[PDB]
Design a binder for these strands. Structure first.
Ligand SMILES: [Mg+2]
Ligand SMILES: [Mg+2]
Ligand SMILES: [Mg+2]
Ligand SMILES: [Mg+2]
Ligand SMILES: [Mg+2]
Ligand SMILES: [Mg+2]
Ligand SMILES: [Mg+2]
Ligand SMILES: [Mg+2]
Ligand SMILES: [Mg+2]
Ligand SMILES: [Mg+2]
Ligand SMILES: [Mg+2]
Ligand SMILES: [Mg+2]
Ligand SMILES: [Mg+2]
Ligand SMILES: [Mg+2]
Ligand SMILES: [Mg+2]
Lengths: 101, 49, 34, 116, 110, 145
RNA sequence: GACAAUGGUAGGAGAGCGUUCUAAGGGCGUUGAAGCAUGAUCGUAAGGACAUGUGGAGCGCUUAGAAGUGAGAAUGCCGGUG
RNA sequence: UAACUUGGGAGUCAGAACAUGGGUGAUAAGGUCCGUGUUCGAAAGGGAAACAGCCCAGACCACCAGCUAAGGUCCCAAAAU
RNA sequence: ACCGAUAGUGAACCAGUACCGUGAGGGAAAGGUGAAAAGCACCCCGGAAGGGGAGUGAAAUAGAACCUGAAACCGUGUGCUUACAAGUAGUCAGAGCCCGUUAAUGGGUGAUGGCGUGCCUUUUGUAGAAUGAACCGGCGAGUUACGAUUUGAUGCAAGGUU
């Protein structure tokens, strides 16, 4: 298993493993490389200061859709003051194939 | 101009301001006439001067 | 001396657990006419 | 000309009754009451997804001042150690490692403990 | 086969009838005419003409045997009312609500 | 949602320990005992189930009070009747029924939920020095400095 | 797009959703209209489509115009029921 | 980064506490009347056990990511017995 | 570019009627089977009411309260859950047991844990022990005509209009 850092946060993975993430700039049927590793134990252990070198993951993408809608609402009492709106947040999807380049 | 493509000029027409038809319009219960006095009365005010 | 509230649909029905009736005896149909 | 209100009324009134579903008693049949709890459900939810972020940052530290205690280490002198090494790994990761293994957690800690 | 019969605009409240029916449901048939006429109520002589119409049509219309033939559904449901008035102490008056019911029985074999 | 593993009923193994109450201050002990019942010091601690362990206490009677508070550490009580403030004890309880005095200081350090009562029904306290719970191989537990 | 700002009562200013009628244009319907009940559907909001059942003769769409044009509260008026 | 002028359209004239400078009162009152500033009013979120005005601090929507103010680190209850 | 059965007339039907008042005088409620009466011959249970079969019809769950048929309210059945428990009644988290969608990061029930004093109006300030609301449904409040003053858009210009 290996650790990455990805957008604003960290994730850990293994092969044959769905993994979701905040949106990225690619088309479908294509590949991507997370140039950011911070720890890999496995058995060939390697941990140090960030962007540990010699570790660039490979993967593949599957879908480029959006999430599900939540509603938003607030109100102050005894005062005629409210609000409503909607949100439906996007996501990229992946699967992991190989662990370094 | 064929009776089903009709478009007057820009800036000519407008929609009214209807009053006391909810909260979000900005003119709801009180309808301008803020709170209780003589100016908030049906047939209020004063002859000018 | 006057109800301050409304009686819900449950508290009305939690109360009638015992507001049923009973069965006669059973001698062979024949009555228990001692 | 005349406008008698029609179905706009009982439409708007059951897009709410259909949201109040799983609620006790007359809070899934009545509009004047349902409407009052659908509202608070919006101000509670708004408040919870800014507090969820404060719950789970307790478990992650709950579960590191257990694991460090095993090997003669507080939480503070652990998270101070790596401040010199430079490990910028978040919690939510140290929870899932030290729950799983010990051997990485043997190296991991010994450098935090090294640099002090 | 599932026969039935209904009695319609019968002049008793439902809340008074429903006490007898709970003693009648999920039982045999000749184990019901007996328990009915040994229950001192006023509901009982009208739920007794309403089995025996569901048993006399599983013999001439649909051809089943009365030997084993049980009761699978009996229930009462509200009906139309009849509004009346009782006078009181001062000039005031007070409501009266004379109520009705519909009765429904189902006899089945297995 | 993501990677924050939960414990459930299956993923838990609960154990039985032993502790000695000779030459110890009262609450200084019970601060360290109510955590073992509660599920800290494991790495599977979750706050909606019972992940903690069983704890046996022996020879309660040899428990010390500093200063002078076997006379002015009163334990009040009431009975929902008029004039019923029963100051039934001061510090006699060390002598009579010592097997309770240790059992109320610990149940106050724990919460008052449908669960934090249950994880105090896994405490066993004796003023003697022998326990009938030898069927379960209860280990010892020396303490923190 | 490199910086930017956005809590809000009285109140002012701006952009729009929906209902009923009319005019012109183009269209759907006994191979099932409006209305009614279900559903896990889309849009930044008011609100909009699609299928499936009952129903059994009349409704939408595009653009402009005219208004008895949107209710939870008035010890509110009328009817039904607890 | 603001002001000055002219013109169209409003609302308000019961104000409170806290600290400070002074009358009246009994160096009494969450008294009552004036002056200078901060907050409630019209403002949510942390701490003071609970609390409209008190110390920190000004919410565009979303996330199971992270650094410090007020106050705080034996257990309830997060962090140095 | 008028209403379409709480509307339009006080009255679409038995309407200045029933009903209230010594009298003068005051005032309601209530429309719809089907294209066609072909308006259920006959058998069975029951004293009759009403229902089950048969038969007319394109359909009788269109059978004289008959076009459609919402909601409150009242009930029958059962997939998950509930008799050591302190509750503005729900929100975020989260195991089990039962299903299988407008095909999506699915839906129903929820043993346990954290937070949490309803809505509107009036007030310096209200969970308030300050007011009003039993519940559901329909109706129910800045308009129109003449004059004035400003802003916007247009047509002709030392001229412009009846
Ligand atoms: Mg406003
Ligand atoms: Mg209002
Ligand atoms: Mg005024
Ligand atoms: Mg007898
Ligand atoms: Mg704003
Ligand atoms: Mg802001
Ligand atoms: Mg129409
Ligand atoms: Mg209107
Ligand atoms: Mg005033
Ligand atoms: Mg001042
Ligand atoms: Mg009608
Ligand atoms: Mg017709
Ligand atoms: Mg005010
Ligand atoms: Mg006052
Ligand atoms: Mg009241």
């Amino acid at each position: 298993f290996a650790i990455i850092e990805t957008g604003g946060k960290q994730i850990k993975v293994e092969e044959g493993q769905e993994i979701f993430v905040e949106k990225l700039d690619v088309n479908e049927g294509d590949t991507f490389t997370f140039d950011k590793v911070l720890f890999v134990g496995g058995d060939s252990v390697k941990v140090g200061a960030p962007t540990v070198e010699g570790a660039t993951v490979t993967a593949t993408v599957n879908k480029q859709g959006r999430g599900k809608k939540i509603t938003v609402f607030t109100y102050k009492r005894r005062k005629n003051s409210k609000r409503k709106k909607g949100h439906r947040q996007p996501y990229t999807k992946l699967t992991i194939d190989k662990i370094n380049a | 101009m064929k009776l089903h493509e009709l478009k007057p000029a820009e800036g000519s027409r407008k929609e009214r301001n209807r009053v006391g038809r909810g909260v979000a319009t900005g003119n709801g219960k009180t309808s301008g006439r803020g709170h209780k006095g003589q100016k908030a009365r049906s047939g209020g005010g004063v002859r000018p001067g | 001396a006057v109800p301050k509230r409304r009686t819900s649909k449950t508290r009305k029905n939690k109360r009638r657990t015992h507001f049923k009736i009973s069965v006669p005896g059973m001698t062979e149909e024949y009555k228990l006419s001692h | 000309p005349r406008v008698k209100g029609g179905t706009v009324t009982r439409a708007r009134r059951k897009k709410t009754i259909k949201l109040a579903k799983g609620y006790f008693g007359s809070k899934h049949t009545l509009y004047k009451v349902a409407k009052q709890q659908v509202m608070k459900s919006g101000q509670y939810a708004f408040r919870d997804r800014r507090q969820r972020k404060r719950d789970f940052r307790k478990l992650w530290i709950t579960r590191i001042n257990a694991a460090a205690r095993q090997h003669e280490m507080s939480y503070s002198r652990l998270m101070n150690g790596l401040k010199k090494a430079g490990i910028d790994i978040n919690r939510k990761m140290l929870s899932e490692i030290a729950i799983s293994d010990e051997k990485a957690f043997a190296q991991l800690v010994t450098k935090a403990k090294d640099a002090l | 086969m599932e026969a039935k019969a209904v009695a319609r605009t019968i002049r008793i409240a439902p809340r008074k009838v429903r006490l007898v029916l709970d003693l009648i449901r999920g039982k045999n048939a000749a184990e019901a005419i007996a328990i009915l006429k040994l229950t001192n109520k006023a509901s009982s002589p009208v739920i007794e003409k309403v089995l025996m119409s569901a048993l006399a049509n599983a013999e001439h219309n649909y051809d089943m045997n009365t030997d084993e033939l049980v009761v699978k559904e009996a229930y009462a449901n509200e009906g139309p009312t009849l509004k009346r008035f009782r006078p009181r102490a001062q000039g005031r008056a007070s409501a009266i609500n004379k109520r009705t019911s519909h009765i429904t029985i189902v006899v089945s074999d297995g | 949602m993501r990677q924050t593993f939960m414990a459930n009923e299956s993923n838990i193994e609960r154990k039985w320990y032993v502790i000695d109450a000779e030459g110890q201050t009262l609450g200084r002990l019970s601060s360290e005992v109510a955590s073992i019942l509660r599920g800290k010091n494991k790495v599977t601690y979750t706050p909606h189930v019972d992940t903690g362990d069983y704890v046996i206490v022996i020879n309660a009677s040899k428990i010390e009070f500093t200063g002078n508070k076997e006379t002015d550490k009163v334990y009040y009580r009431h009975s929902n009747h008029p004039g019923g403030i029963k100051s039934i004890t001061a510090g006699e309880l060390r002598r009579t029924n010592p097997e309770r005095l240790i059992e109320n200081s610990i149940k106050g350090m724990l919460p008052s939920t449908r669960l934090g009562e249950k994880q105090g029904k896994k405490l066993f306290v004796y003023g003697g020095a022998e326990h009938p719970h030898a069927a379960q191989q209860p280990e010892n537990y020396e303490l923190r400095g």
